[PDB]
C-alpha cells in the first residue's frame, strides 16, 4: 500500500502488473478500479453504492459505469474517464446522482497507508470516509486487507455498513 495515494487516475495507464503465459503479447492490459460504500442499516433496505472504471492501456481509453444499487432484504450509469475526469456517457436527469459522480474520487486517488486492524477515528482513511460519505454509525471501523481493501463498520446480520476498494489488472 505503499503507492497509495495515486491522485492522478492516468499513473496508472503506465503501471505494469501480474502478467501470465495465458496473457496476450499485443495486450498492454487494463485496470479494473472499483470503489463501493455499502451501507445496510437494520432490518431496512440496503443501499449499495460506487463506480467501476476500465483502463484499457493499450488504447489509453477509460470508460464504466457509476452504480446505484438498492436491494430487499441495479441501476448503471455509463461514465468514460478523461484526463483524471470522470464524466458521464448517458444522460442523466437526477441531480443528486449528477453530482455525486461530479465530486467522486476512488480511494486509490485519496486513500493513505490476509490482514487485520482495529482502527480509530482519528485514523486517516477513517476521516476520509466519512466526510466524502453519509455514514451511520458513529463506531471506528476494522480494516481488511486480503487487492482488496475493506473497512467494516458495523456486522451484525442485521445491519451492515462496509466499504470495499479494489484495483485489480486483467487480459482485455
Ligand atoms: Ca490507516
Same mark, same amino acid.
Given at each position: ?83 483524471? /475526469?470522470?464524466?458521464?456517457? +448517458?444522460? !442523466? ?5 449528477? $453530482?455525486?459522480? &461530479? @465530486?467522486?474520487? =476512488? ?34 471501523? /476494522?480494516?481488511?486487507?486480503? +487487492?482488496? !481493501? ?5 456486522? $451484525?446480520?442485521? &445491519? @451492515?455498513?462496509? =466499504? ?9
Amino acid at each position: 500500500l505503499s503507492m497509495y495515494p495515486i491522485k492522478n487516475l492516468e499513473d496508472l495507464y503506465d503501471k505494469e502488473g501480474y502478467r501470465d503465459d495465458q496473457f496476450d503479447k499485443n495486450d498492454k492490459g487494463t485496470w479494473i478500479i472499483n470503489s463501493e460504500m455499502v451501507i445496510q442499516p437494520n432490518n431496512e433496505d440496503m443501499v449499495a453504492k460506487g463506480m467501476v472504471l476500465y483502463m484499457n492501456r493499450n488504447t489509453k481509453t477509460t470508460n464504466g459505469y457509476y452504480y446505484v444499487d438498492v436491494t430487499k432484504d441495479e441501476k448503471r450509469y455509463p461514465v468514460k474517464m478523461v484526463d483524471n /475526469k470522470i464524466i458521464p456517457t +448517458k444522460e !442523466i436527469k437526477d441531480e443528486k446522482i449528477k $453530482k455525486e459522480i &461530479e @465530486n467522486f474520487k =476512488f480511494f486509490v486517488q485519496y486513500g493513505d497507508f490476509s490482514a487485520k486492524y482495529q482502527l480509530t477515528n482519528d485514523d486517516y482513511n477513517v476521516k476520509q470516509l466519512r466526510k466524502r460519505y453519509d455514514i451511520p454509525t458513529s463506531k471506528a471501523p /476494522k480494516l481488511l486487507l486480503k +487487492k482488496d !481493501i475493506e473497512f467494516t463498520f458495523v456486522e $451484525k446480520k442485521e &445491519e @451492515n455498513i462496509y =466499504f470495499s476498494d479494489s484495483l485489480d489488472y486483467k487480459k482485455s
